[PDB]
Amino acid sequence: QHMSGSEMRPARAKFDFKAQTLKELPLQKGDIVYIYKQIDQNWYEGEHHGRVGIFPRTYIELLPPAEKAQPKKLTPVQVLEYGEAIAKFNFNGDTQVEMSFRKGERITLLRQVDENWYEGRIPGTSRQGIFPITYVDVIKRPL
Description:
With 143 residues, this protein is an all-beta fold. The chain has two domains: 1-70, SH3 type barrels (Roll); 71-143, SH3 Domains (SH3 type barrels, Roll), CATH 2.30.30. The chain has strands spanning 9-13, 32-37, 43-48, 51-56, 60-62, 83-87, 106-112, 117-121, 128-132, 136-140. It has a five-stranded antiparallel beta sheet, with no helix packed on it. Strands 9-8-7-6-10 form a five-stranded antiparallel beta sheet, with no helix packed on it. A hairpin with a 4-residue loop joins strand 7 and strand 8. It is rod-shaped, with a radius of gyration of 31 Å. Plays a role in tyrosine phosphorylation of CBL by linking CBL to the insulin receptor. Required for insulin-stimulated glucose transport. Involved in formation of actin stress fibers and focal adhesions. This is Sorbin and SH3 domain-containing protein 1.
């Protein structure tokens, strides 16, 4: 609400730095530090090993780049699957709203118009149309 206290950023120590004063704290190559406040353009301040001090920004890397694609693991939720179906009988429509298919093509279930009618499309979205359920066979209902 106040809009103050920006979040710190993870910085990586490019090299090791020896503390010369109490304000300055020691840093070792590879040591990760968090910059909660920038002392100056040439000096940065952050926390390391539970300690706080200052060091030349030229010795650390502010939020280093990520070479990993970052798969973000996975989750059982936030998922979806399209339904599958196959025509039971050859079908030859004569209208744009009505598509055509043979007695062996796969169909993607989208939704049910009413009870005996539904909308579907061929994988890849090549064709789309409506037709009676009694003329198609379902393989897997949508979740």
